[PDB]
């Protein structure tokens, strides 16, 4: 019925690939910095509007 098999003496390790996580961290950090820059741009725009 589609089930697997059992192997004695073995163990299934985590299926986490430590390679792609670092590049994903780089991309996430850059995207977060870009969004924070957008927040700063909006705040600066509104501040210089209200400086009048």
């Amino acid at each position: 019925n589609g089930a697997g098999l059992l192997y004695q003496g073995y163990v299934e390790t985590s299926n986490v690939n430590v390679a792609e996580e670092l590049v994903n961290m780089i991309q996430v950090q850059r995207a977060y910095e870009i969004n924070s820059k957008a927040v700063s741009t909006t705040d600066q725009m509104l501040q210089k509007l209200t400086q009048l």
């Binding site: 430590v18 390679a19 670092l22 590049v23 780089i26």
Partner: protein, 49 residues
């Protein structure tokens, strides 16, 4: 089979065959050590960015 008194069976090991097999096994063991070193450096660069 038949038996024979006053005699014994040997160890059926030839040093000629084992010594050549030991040399081959050692290199195979040496070789895989390169992969660990290669995988170690290939990961060291990534974490250090």
């Amino acid at each position: 089979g038949k038996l024979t008194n006053g005699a014994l069976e040997a160890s059926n090991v030839d040093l000629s065959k084992e010594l050549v097999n030991m040399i081959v096994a050692q290199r195979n063991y040496q070789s895989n050590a390169q992969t660990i070193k290669t995988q170690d450096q290939i990961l060291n660069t990534l974490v250090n960015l």
